[model samples]
Target: RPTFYRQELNKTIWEVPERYQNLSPVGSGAYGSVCAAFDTKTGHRVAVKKLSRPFQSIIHAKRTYRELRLLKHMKHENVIGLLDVFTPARSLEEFNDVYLVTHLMGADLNNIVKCQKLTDDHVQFLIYQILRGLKYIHSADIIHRDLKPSNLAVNEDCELKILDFGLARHVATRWYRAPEIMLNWMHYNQTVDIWSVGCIMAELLTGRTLFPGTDHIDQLKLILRLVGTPGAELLKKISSESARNYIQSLAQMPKMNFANVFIGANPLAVDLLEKMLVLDSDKRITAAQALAHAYFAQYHDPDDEPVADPYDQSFESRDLLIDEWKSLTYDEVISFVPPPLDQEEMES
Candidate 1:
């Protein structure tokens, strides 16, 4: 017997009746819980994420709104796509639940890193997509503050996509967080993401997190041990007096060799990794710059030119109301047409 109950709520919606089937809990995080389910209408296996008490607080509501907007606007192969959205609300009072439909992946980068069979090519492809994805987000003036391995999705074929935008607003994760953010600067930009990339790169090469710190202070100390103290010029950029003074108080340390840190890694890859792990945000290599580096020389498409996205960028958190959000999502679903995949890409 089917465990599903076709209640009065779904009976009203004829087209999308029994929205999903065979739902099994997959994962959970600060944002919400995810489940693997089959889209009853589309006949595709998808992951459904329900917002964590979205209307419980203003912050949660705003976060849910922003995430919806960002995902709507961000359309790239390396970025996750929103397929459909479902809400079980008949009126304002009943409008609390939100379920997001997205492609399901085999695993995340966090698990892939621990695999003993992980290869150099795997690291290269993974790092390349990370930069390419960051390039697209930065081009749109959006910063992905959270870039830990757990947030990166991967499959058996080695395709990758970045997910989880709830913490994308400069919320620094101690280990992979950038120096500018750690010091509590006035503002930080996409370079914060690059710093994260460096941390991830080192981890992939060494099969361990490069800077695993116990706390915020330990995180800074771990960075200082590897990167050494920034010069007076870079330290001048720090606005916090206490933070600057504390950094100055620390004993001067020399920059450690990349080869030593990422033992037996390629020299070219190490060179590019060095460019990204700079203590100063201004000095950190941009995602665009990293893609053109010698490390990705073989993979770089010299003919590919950068172009701004043609869509309205302000759609991200524009004056769209709560009710209108569901309407727009439904509209997109009806008129939904996915971009064509290249034949070679499909084969790959």
Candidate 2:
């Protein structure tokens, strides 16, 4: 059979690559289906993520846009990248499915942090990479919003890559949310992500969640009990009347010492952790500042700052209206050799 005949014959309705064999399923979530496959052409292992009806709804369309736009623009070592994109459709009007291709790793932080025992050097190196990635992402004026352990991908070498850009506009995982995100919606910045980093840091060191709240109200209660209540001034900044009232009603609890919170952690590490987990966004350490903290004194270098090419895409910062979501139709999605997928650990 001719190669062209085989290629055409192998194409599925979804446009998934027929050459990528090893059909073992990895996972399936709200995002889409994933599988671990060995690409016959490159002789390499790659992850294939099929997006769940990215254009089925406006919200899905919006998320698909952000993830694609950001991943294509971002070039950080600690951030996931787009290795290849393919769709089965021949034209935009016919395009309905999206698939993302990228390098495969061993596991996600959710599995690793829970099952593995990390040493002090391990913790420092991992946290350093997270902050370094944040520094790059924040410079572009994009907020990750979702920074839980599950969103962090890791290999056996302790290398971590942050993923799941769908929640870039919305906060996620109650336990890892920042105080401002939990209190009332304000124009949050990169600092909101720092709060999650703090939560994750604590969890990594202690082998448990820092704040496991049952719900929103309970989340606030847990924050107060551990970190203590926010000051009246801070409460006043909460624009939501109900949130402000609740903060005022709670008894004024004193802040817990870092020593007690991170029991047995290095003083410098705990000190840095405190700076990241502050109740006030203004007080939370920026990623660049976090990198400079004494906890990373040995690894700190004035020149380690990333200077990658900046994102020049005009589509990145604007908010899409419900109607505008149509611009991201099946055709546009398949047209882009550049694509986005709701990334879950497929086979790794």
Candidate 3:
């Protein structure tokens, strides 16, 4: 394939080079699938994601428009960049695939935070990038419903790029999701993503998900675990069995003081973790707002100061990436609920 540049959109369908078959499968979901492909023509390597089926005859038309418009407008070095778009104008592949190619990245924040242990400051930086990303996402009126660790990727330069917008409902992902939507709220803005960011941050800093709960009942239980249980009426209002499970789990869990939970944890890490996990999504700090928090405010370690890049290159292996992910013991992580049969281990 000739290197595809910001070229003239003269054709509807085209083939990438045989070598550029670099379009190897990378990520997948119900909406569609993604591949790590290279545009030999461009100097850039990118991940190509395609919708399983277009919302209509037009695939990725609106999403492509939104993403391109958003990417073009939001040029924060931390945000993901749109490299090009490929739609089959009148070919066999045209009916099956409409591709949105973006700059390829290494590991995602979710993988690093979940699989490895990281320092409190590093964990804060992860949160910093995510929230910062959210700040931009919200500013664009884009509500990324799927704001999980997996969705956050580290570019080759190590900057965090929020990827995978398929489930990004212009709203919240149902799991570890925010309450704003449940309350029949539509005008609610990026705070929902902030709540999602909080959940990911907590998991990163603690090495355990405060609320991995999948259902409403378990979710509330997970929610109540950190904060005390909610009012009886509030408890009665939740329809999730998992949320109730969360309640039961909360009832059964041994009580302890939260102030002491961070005894050995870096205070800055705990402070930001708590703020993001606040039950009231409205009260949960916004990404921009988080940058203003005492944690970021008081971080005196010159190392904690912002860096041009999001990660460190000096550390050997993926150790630096796990700074906060280390909260979980290696054994516990191994034993924790495993991924699906095919996904239990890294696919690399």
Candidate 4:
């Protein structure tokens, strides 16, 4: 049973279910626009993201499917929860829009970092939560591919959740983009995410982007200047001969001392950053290893941290028709069941 209504939000028409009310724009991107709304059925504020023209292109359609699949399967405290999904269209011909419902967060890390001076305690807890979430994400053999301040959401209580699982090759900002990705290296893995995490950690400590590169080449130059030139053996592994020669030809530079750059920062935090920002993807620390680092000793609890079963990635290779994708998406949307209310909600 579905009840629907059409409303105009941010100049885009949204056809959503009746339970969602008071819709207002929060943010919009090339992919879609999001609105803050009240979920009357659950008595909670929610974010309704209406993905734009999800089936317009094969690439867009595949990403839409991937995001929906990942969100439905993910369950972790530090990961954004998918509350509901719907579409007002009744048949395949009419189906063109999709709305995703999620818990509405107060702000993203980018906005918070720009306005607030965070204490070391705040930094520690935030990083700990990110690693906790990444550990779970990595366990599924899925790479977040994009991990930056904007993709991380936070509320007033210092709680954080990671969002946006769409694929990235050239998608992430150049500042947070991994070196391997910039070099166009093949066979890069989860370590690319660790590079982004290290960049974010630096940003939190200093309240400024570590590498604000103007372009791909500038981005690599900024990274090498700080992390220093990669070793010959590592450069040899690069698939592109020109890329390998480019690094080898650079002026030999020594790694900058972390203490000097992150003056007055905790020694343990610097050490963790060093491990995470390794130039070699193979050498970069894994999310699980990062959680156990001394900087997170107070908050790290191996017993409490959980891992997810490996995500099914077989669909990545398949080339399905738009109708098939639409059918699968419709099935996913109709299968939603809201979780039971917690004790906190009952008491309120």
Error of 4 at 285 (Å): 0.7
Judging by lDDT against the true structure, name the best candidate.
4
lDDT of 4 at 200: 95
Residue-level lDDT tens digits of model 4 in 81-132: 7888787888767878888888998899999898898999999999999999
The lDDT values for all models are: 0.73, 0.74, 0.55, 0.86
lDDT of 1: 0.73
| Model 4: CA > 4 A from native | 169-172
lDDT per residue for candidate 3 within 140-170, as digits (tens), equals 5566676776678885545677775533332
Cα-based TM-score, every candidate:
0.83, 0.85, 0.66, 0.95
lDDT of 3 at 140: 56
State the lDDT at 65 in candidate 1: 64
lDDT of 2 at 183: 49
Clashing pairs in 4: none
Model 1 misplaced regions, further than 4 Å: 1-19, 166-173, 240-242, 302-348
TM for candidate 4 is: 0.95
Model 1 Cα lDDT, one tens digit per residue, 205-254: 88888889988889888998888888888877667799778777878898
Candidate 2's displacement at residue 317, Å, is: 6.9
